[PDB]
């Protein structure tokens, strides 16, 4: 146990500093040490109970406190990275991914800060499921099932409930499409994701005023919703809205992904071309930090 603990620590030190911002090879170092000494225990030591126990204790010792954990001065840097690794696996065949997630599980069984990892993974799963960038949902369901078997019952039910929420929203969209199929379709297509507030970790943002270009449509849909279901109200989050743009002016056709903020800024250019920060700030009351981040994203 002492030798294998020092060996895992030595491997992590040999990595040292490039593992703060790259979770893949940190988790892979941990897994390489674990697999080497697990094979050694199974073959040479006849799969004895005490020797596997020593393996488990040393592995759990060097996972939770190592070079990057000390450097960040937070043991929660160990599950966080693991969570990020999961995200890296589930962005946008099946057997390889399933084996990789089982390896993620054999790492995760040694995590003592399970709530930190679970909160990180819940927020990342929410960010994934909201708009786009999700792999085959078979993998996500299998991940939720593995968390079911490993952890308790309530948190995985929370995750399954937000999955059921996205499914219910998809079913409502299908119902709306069916309703429009046997009627007169509108001039434009509207898509919404109706999500439970309790299950999703989102927070209310700054107040925003709807422009006059969509007020009539919004009022009409609100009246229709009240007629169909007067007992439910929609808390609109304009910060998380999306948008696709096609530039039909060049020889080649491009696709641009941008939010409503981008289109509002572009629509503001119909009158002037050069904009002063002070004028827009006084007119719209926008904090310096958020617009600075927006400009940095624009430049990057």
């Amino acid at each position: 146990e002492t030798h294998i603990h020092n060996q895992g620590l030595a491997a992590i030190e040999k990595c040292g500093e490039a593992a703060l911002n790259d979770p893949k090879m940190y988790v892979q170092t941990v897994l390489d040490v674990h697999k080497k000494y697990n094979a050694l225990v199974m073959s040479a030591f006849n799969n004895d109970a005490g020797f596997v126990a020593a393996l488990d204790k040393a592995c759990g010792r060097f996972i939770n406190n190592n070079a990057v954990t000390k450097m960040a001065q937070s043991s929660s840097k160990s599950p966080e990275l693991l969570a990020r690794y999961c995200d890296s696996l589930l962005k946008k065949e099946e057997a390889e991914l399933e084996d990789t997630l089982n390896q993620v599980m054999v790492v995760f069984k040694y995590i003592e800060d399970k709530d930190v990892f679970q909160k990180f993974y819940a927020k990342m799963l929410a960010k994934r499921l909201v708009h786009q960038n999700s792999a085959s949902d078979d993998a996500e369901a299998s991940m939720i099932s593995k968390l079911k078997q490993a952890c308790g019952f309530e948190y995985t039910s929370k995750l399954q409930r937000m999955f059921q929420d996205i499914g219910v929203s998809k079913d409502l969209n299908e119902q709306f499409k069916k309703h429009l199929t046997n009627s007169e379709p509108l001039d434009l297509d509207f898509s919404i994701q109706v999500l439970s507030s309790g299950s999703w970790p989102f927070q209310q943002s700054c107040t925003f005023a709807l422009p006059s270009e969509l007020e009539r449509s919004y009022q009409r849909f609100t009246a229709f919703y009240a007629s169909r279901h007067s007992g439910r109200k929609l808390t609109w989050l304009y910060q998380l809205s999306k948008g696709e743009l096609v530039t039909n002016c060049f020889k080649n056709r491009y696709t641009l992904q941008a939010s409503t903020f981008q289109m509002a800024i572009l629509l503001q250019y119909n009158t002037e071309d050069a904009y002063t920060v002070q004028q827009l700030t006084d007119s719209t009351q926008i904090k310096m930090d958020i617009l600075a981040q927006v400009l940095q994203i624009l430049l990057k």
């Binding site: 909201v130 297509d189 898509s191 507030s197 999703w200 270009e213 439910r232 989050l237």
Partner: peptide
């Protein structure tokens, strides 16, 4: 030239009970 049109609008909303 420099003309933009709206075709799709993907929004997000949360539902909660109106009793309280």
């Amino acid at each position: 030239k420099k003309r933009f049109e709206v075709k799709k609008w993907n929004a997000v909303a949360l539902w909660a009970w109106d009793i309280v």
